[PDB]
Paper text:
Mutational analysis of four functional amino acids, which are similarly positioned in the three reductase structures, indicated despite the insignificant sequence identity, a common catalytic mechanism with a 5‐iminium cation of methylene‐tetrahydropterin as intermediate protonated by a shared glutamate. Based on mutational and kinetic analysis, evidence has been provided that all three methylene‐tetrahydropterin reductases have the same fold, similar methylene‐tetrahydropterin binding positions, and the same basic catalytic mechanism; however, the binding modes of the C1 carriers and reductants significantly deviate.
Crystal structures for the apoenzyme of jMer and the binary jMer‐[name] complex were determined at a resolution of 1.8 and 1.9 Å, respectively. The active site of jMer is located in a cleft between the α/β‐barrel domain and a helix‐bundle subdomain composed of five helices. In the experimentally determined jMer‐[name] structure, [name] is associated with the α/β‐barrel domain with the isoalloxazine ring positioned at the bottom of the cleft in contact with the C‐terminal loops of most strands of the (αβ)8 barrel. The cleft is sufficiently large to also accommodate methylene‐H4MPT with the pterin head adjacent to the isoalloxazine ring of [name]. The NPCP bond in jMer is located in the loop after β3, below the central pyridine ring of [name], between Gly61 and Val62.
Numbering used by the authors:
A (entry chain B): 1 to 260, 265 to 330
B (entry chain A): 1 to 331
The structure:
Amino acid sequence: MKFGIEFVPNEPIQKLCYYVKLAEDNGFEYCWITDHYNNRNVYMALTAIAMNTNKIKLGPGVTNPYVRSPAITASAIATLDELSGGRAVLGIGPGDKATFDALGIEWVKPVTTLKESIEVIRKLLAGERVSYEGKVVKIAGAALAVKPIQKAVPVYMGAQGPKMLETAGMIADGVLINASNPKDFEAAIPLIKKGAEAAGRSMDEIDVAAYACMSVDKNADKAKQAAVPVVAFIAAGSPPVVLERHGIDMEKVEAIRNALFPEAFKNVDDTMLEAFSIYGTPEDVVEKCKKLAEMGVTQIVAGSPIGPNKETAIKLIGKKVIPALK
Amino acid sequence: MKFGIEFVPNEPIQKLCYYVKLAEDNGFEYCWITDHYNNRNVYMALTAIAMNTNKIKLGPGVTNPYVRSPAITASAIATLDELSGGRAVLGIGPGDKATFDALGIEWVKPVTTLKESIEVIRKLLAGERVSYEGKVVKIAGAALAVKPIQKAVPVYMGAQGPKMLETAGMIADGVLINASNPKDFEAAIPLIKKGAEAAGRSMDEIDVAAYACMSVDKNADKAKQAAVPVVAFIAAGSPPVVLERHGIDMEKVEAIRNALKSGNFPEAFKNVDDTMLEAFSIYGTPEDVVEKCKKLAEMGVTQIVAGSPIGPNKETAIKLIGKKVIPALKE
Ligand SMILES: C[C@H](OP(=O)(O)OC[C@@H](O)[C@@H](O)[C@@H](O)Cn1c2nc(=O)[nH]c(=O)c-2cc2ccc(O)cc21)C(=O)N[C@@H](CCC(=O)N[C@@H](CCC(=O)O)C(=O)O)C(=O)O
Ligand SMILES: C[C@H](OP(=O)(O)OC[C@@H](O)[C@@H](O)[C@@H](O)Cn1c2nc(=O)[nH]c(=O)c-2cc2ccc(O)cc21)C(=O)N[C@@H](CCC(=O)N[C@@H](CCC(=O)O)C(=O)O)C(=O)O
């Protein structure tokens, strides 16, 4: 099993550089930084991370076709790959309606715009002159001067909806799914497989990644309790099909959505902690990851909280979780 | 053949970080930075270099037991290995009398000092609490809190003389020999092998490195011209044994010795001839240099250090070596 780590660049980048180097020392293989206009800029954070790291893969987790021209994205990814000596990965997704409303941006065909941005980004990274008259994305004679070091920078798609999961199976080198429980993947992987069989691809070409809420501590209950605030936020934002897949009292969920705080947090129960987070001792967490692996998951991203204390939990994971899971 | 690159940190450290990143891009595997009190500090240079690189191995080429405590050398190396994610190498040598006469440092038994220093550095790096009552190095209760990432950081000895070569066979993970010609390695690798056999070691455990003067250019004569000033210095400093081995006109040498002594660089270079260029440098076209490196591999060289001048232009030369030399010699 491969492990990733994710951070919002909402603290001074030096602190983030410490966490990621700590993650590299502890055998994490992927570093994913969120991209939102209100936080520190993702590529500037990835530059500093690159300079403080040596082996860990890194890149946006995830950017999108809208807040920058896909041409700019491609050139940013190439710069990162150059600087890091061939370690870049491109996490890319459609974004969200709240953002583009705020920014005055049209949320044009999410699935198509993404598919086509990705095809255009792959070609520019290959050093091709690109003339591409898509439905949404339209390029005329663009070329990069900057080159990546890798022949093909991996592209990981964020996908929650059915079409995106299938579109990912057809084009993506990997898929980031905001899920933490094996049932979420029993459903979504066939949807990716459908796309992958369609396009002639084996599932060996596709890193299915669990972008999970993790919370590991030496004390099971200290760990469980660190999970609670993120779990309460998940339950709120989940669509009913997920609510029905794991069997969640929409009663609590109206009480959590409403309370949102300590009232929101009080209504979080054990079926929700089962459903939206890998929590427990290292031995509990090692077991939950084993199960996700049987379901086709090849990367687990230890998202927030990483534990009650991120620093302590990164180290605990390095000592007692990563080596037990190959 | 693995390739290394050498650099004196005598320009702003950002310029050096560019050259090393460029060498990494171009497939060089080792970066060796000299350690002399008059230039930029070797470990501050290596720190910056580590932050601008990702996979090239890096270290001092070479430090010595005298200008810092060996315990300070150990923790500096551990700090480098931590920062770089496990890429450090410790190049270490006895230093030189001229420096320690300048600095008021007694050049005590260079071979026993070096062996004892290397042994203490390794025990320190292995995390041991160290009490060591050597003939020169005496340590009581010392222990590092800083830990390397590599279980064993490699130790490369710089070695020109036969007792230093023998010692390297017994204790070193690699040997940096300042020489560019197969005749030097014919003479030296038997000496290394004797120490290895005495210590019970295979020669697969030992990276024999030619710390060479290299000058490559699409134009062989331009390459040759660029190597002269460095060759002038190597001929001048060569011990007497080395110059007869290669048949250097010893009168052309003294003329080079006086000119550099006075700082008369143009007079020094006027006295360098083809015999010293073939003796003390690897020069010419990429095809020429590839052939010369194969003749070095034949004597038992497993790393070539593309030392100064690298080429007429360092930046151009690093790229040409990357494109036309390293791939040809890559097992
Ligand atoms: C757009 C939406 O896609 P979704 O897969 O359900 O959810 C998208 C999320 O993944 C998206 O919000 C991500 O960008 C969020 N995301 C982040 N978004 C950000 O931009 N920044 C972040 O840092 C970020 C982090 C993050 C981390 C992990 C991750 O797991 C995702 C991340 C959707 O509606 N998908 C539908 C497509 C429906 C649709 O849009 N149809 C249109 C277009 C179809 C076409 O024309 O091709 C139509 O009917 O015409 C589906 O899958 O069926
Ligand atoms: C001490 C001297 O050793 P040497 O092997 O000739 O030293 C030449 C170089 O290796 C040495 O000067 C290096 O430190 C110089 N050097 C630099 N030295 C620096 O300190 N900084 C540098 O950056 C540097 C760069 C460098 C790069 C490559 C390189 O290959 C050498 C480098 C010597 O005379 N050795 C003889 C005699 C050994 C000896 O001293 N025996 C004594 C001592 C006995 C005892 O100590 O126990 C005796 O028998 O009485 C021998 O090897 O046989």
